[PDB]
């Protein structure tokens, strides 16, 4: 009936002065736009059909044409930025916001879906959706005593659309929009559906990626213990954004970092630092690096949790990106740590894997490692044990690597390597 229609036939049906012919033609366009292989989105746009679909959204008297036109427009808005712009330029944003209050659940859900796609395009469309007043009717759909009474797919779509209103930077979402969304987001973060949990975590990871004032808004809502619980989930789609949010929070103040430690996050790091997914090990090591960039009592918590042997592990063997983050974690630890904490790092066997990484063809990691060597020597200087460290570096072949770096192309590497040779190996 409405399967495999040409664009010409769809246009003829939509241009008829017959509501049923228009409905049949709109359903045919929806089915064309829903096909797996190459839907003709540009052909539908070029035929001038977006203004027709947008007017059909306002036909309260014909709920099937509202649903078919909403679905057709959701498929166009899900495309490229130019395709999402064509939907916005057709006036679809206020028309979809009016459909959020529809008595038909499948229509309201379609409007939620469409607005998530529009807001998801970037900062300008996200902020334009917010200015048209989408937040109040979106939140009203979730204002129920128990989230469990809502249809599963409907709740997942609402969570995903809210996560897109939290997404993107330059600029970050408006402060008052974030404050308005946050209580519902905290509630979704305690829901038991894995997809709702993943998208709630992604939303929180977006809101905590920026200035420390942005982190504060989130941390003040008391979400850190729930994020640490999700950090220990078995589902990789949940662990990934929960680790990103935790990693983002520890880029903040010493106080914000302390909330992550107090909630018991460090107890999860033996498994995260050995996780079979390289992106988990990488982002877990980045998180560790920002904790070792903290206070001496915070470095001590890393020590007490037995995480220094786990840092020796990732520095010894891991994908190069994780090893570079491990090098940062060590340089941060040696910069802020006490002599006792730095001595403990050497006793855990940091020197040999730190030296082996001086062979890497990455100028940034070389600078980071040479800075760590200098900090370890400064601690050894305070104990008069520089000779014991010099022999250790010589024995694992570290001396040959530092000597070779005296003829390096980079200025900072050349200067730091010549400095170590003259001060401790002459």
């Amino acid at each position: 009936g409405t399967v495999n229609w040409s664009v010409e036939d769809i246009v003829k049906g939509i241009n008829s002065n017959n509501l049923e012919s228009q409905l049949q033609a709109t359903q045919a366009a929806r089915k064309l736009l829903s096909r797996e292989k190459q839907p003709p989105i540009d052909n539908i746009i070029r035929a001038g059909l977006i203004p027709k679909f947008v007017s059909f959204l306002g036909k309260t008297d014909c709920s099937p044409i509202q649903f078919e036109s909403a679905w057709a427009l959701t498929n166009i808005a899900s495309g490229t930025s130019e395709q999402t712009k064509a939907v916005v330029d057709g006036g679809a944003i206020p028309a979809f916001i009016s459909l959020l209050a529809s008595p038909h659940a499948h229509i309201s859900e379609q409007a939620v879906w469409a607005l998530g796609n529009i807001a998801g395009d970037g900062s300008a469309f996200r902020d334009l959706v917010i200015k048209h007043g989408a937040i109040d009717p979106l939140l009203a759909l979730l204002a129920v005593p128990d989230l469990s009474t809502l249809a599963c797919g409907y709740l997942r779509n609402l969570t995903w659309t809210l996560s897109n209103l939290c997404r993107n930077k330059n600029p970050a979402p408006p402060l008052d929009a974030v404050e308005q969304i946050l209580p519902t987001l905290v509630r979704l973060l305690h829901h038991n559906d894995p997809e709702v949990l993943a998208d709630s975590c992604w939303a929180i990871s977006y809101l905590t990626d920026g200035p420390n004032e942005r982190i504060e808004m989130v941390v003040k809502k008391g979400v850190v213990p729930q994020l640490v619980k999700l950090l220990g989930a078995t589902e990789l789609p949940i662990v990934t954004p929960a680790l990103r949010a935790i990693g983002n929070i520890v880029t903040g103040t010493d106080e914000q970092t302390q909330k992550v430690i107090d909630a018991g996050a460090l107890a999860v790091f033996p498994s995260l630092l050995t996780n079979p997914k390289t992106n988990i090990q990488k982002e877990a090591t980045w998180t560790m690096s920002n904790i070792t960039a903290g206070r001496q009592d915070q470095i001590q918590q890393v020590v007490n949790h037995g995480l220094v042997p786990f840092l020796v592990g990732v520095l010894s063997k891991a994908d190069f990106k994780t090893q570079k983050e491990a090098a940062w974690a060590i340089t941060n630890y040696t910069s802020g740590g006490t002599v006792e904490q730095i001595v403990y790092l050497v006793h855990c066997g940091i020197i040999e894997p730190l030296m082996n990484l001086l062979s890497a063809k990455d100028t940034k990691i070389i600078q980071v490692i040479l800075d760590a060597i200098s900090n370890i020597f400064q601690a050894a200087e305070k104990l008069g044990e520089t000779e014991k460290l010099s022999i250790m570096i010589e024995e694992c072949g570290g001396l040959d690597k530092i000597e070779a770096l005296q003829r390096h192309e980079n200025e900072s590497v050349y200067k730091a390597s010549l400095n170590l040779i003259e001060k401790y190996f002459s």
Binding site: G210, R244, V250, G252, S289, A293, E325, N332
Partner: peptide
């Protein structure tokens, strides 16, 4: 030593 935000690390 100094905190690194997500975009400054990757």
């Amino acid at each position: 030593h100094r905190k690194r935000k997500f975009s400054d690390a990757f």
